[PDB]
Design an enzyme around this catalytic site. Sequence first.
Site, PDB file in Angstrom:
ATOM      1  N   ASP A  15       4.795-100.690  38.220  1.00 29.70           N
ATOM      2  CA  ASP A  15       3.524-100.601  37.561  1.00 29.70           C
ATOM      3  C   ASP A  15       3.441-101.297  36.218  1.00 29.70           C
ATOM      4  O   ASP A  15       4.434-101.847  35.736  1.00 29.70           O
ATOM      5  CB  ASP A  15       3.050 -99.147  37.515  1.00 29.70           C
ATOM      6  CG  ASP A  15       3.716 -98.272  36.487  1.00 29.70           C
ATOM      7  OD1 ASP A  15       4.675 -98.851  35.802  1.00 29.70           O
ATOM      8  OD2 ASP A  15       3.371 -97.123  36.307  1.00 29.70           O
ATOM      9  N   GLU A  69      -6.533-100.957  41.205  1.00 29.94           N
ATOM     10  CA  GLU A  69      -5.147-100.752  41.516  1.00 29.94           C
ATOM     11  C   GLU A  69      -4.531-101.712  42.513  1.00 29.94           C
ATOM     12  O   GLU A  69      -3.317-101.865  42.546  1.00 29.94           O
ATOM     13  CB  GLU A  69      -4.921 -99.333  42.070  1.00 29.94           C
ATOM     14  CG  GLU A  69      -5.351 -98.271  41.074  1.00 29.94           C
ATOM     15  CD  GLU A  69      -4.410 -98.101  39.924  1.00 29.94           C
ATOM     16  OE1 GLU A  69      -3.348 -98.867  39.991  1.00 29.94           O
ATOM     17  OE2 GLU A  69      -4.634 -97.347  38.968  1.00 29.94           O
TER      18      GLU A  69
END
EC number: 3.2.1.17
Length: 164
Positions: free
Chosen positions: A20, A11
Site C-alpha cells: 500500500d 483503491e
Amino acid sequence: MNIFEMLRIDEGLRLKIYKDTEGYYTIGIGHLLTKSPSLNAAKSELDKHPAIGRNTNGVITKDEAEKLFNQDVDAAVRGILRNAKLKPVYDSLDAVRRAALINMVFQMGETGVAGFTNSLRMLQQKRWDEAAVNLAKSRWYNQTPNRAKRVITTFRTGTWDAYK
C-alpha cells in the site's frame, strides 16, 4: 455512482498481494492483510480470512476480492456509527457526501478521521468550501493528493463530478 464504485476507483483492483501507499501488504480492493514485513506473514493472514479460508498463495479471484470489499465497507460504516465524533457528522450529510466520509474512514480508519477536528466541524455546519479549503492543507492531502482531491471535491459539491 456510489461508495463501492467510488472506492473501487480510489483503491484499484489487485488480485495479487501488493504494497500500500504506506508499505503494507494488502490485496484486492484495499484489503490490508498485515502490517508485518513478511510476505509469508501476509499470505498466512490471507489464507486464514473467513471469506477465503483456502490456500491462495498470494492470489485471489475477483469474487473473493469483492467479498472482502463488501465486508471492509460495512466495517467502515460501523466505525463511523460507532464513533462519537463521526456519527453526528454522518447523520448531517447527504447521500453523496456520506460516501466521501466513508471513503476517508475506509482509507484511514475511524480514529484517524476522527482527528480532523476543524474539518468535521465545518462539515457539520455545512460549510463546504471552507471544509474543502481546510482539508486541502492536511498531511493526508500531501500524502495521497490525487485521491484526496476527488474526495474533497466530493464534499465541496456534493456531486460525483470528480469521478466522472
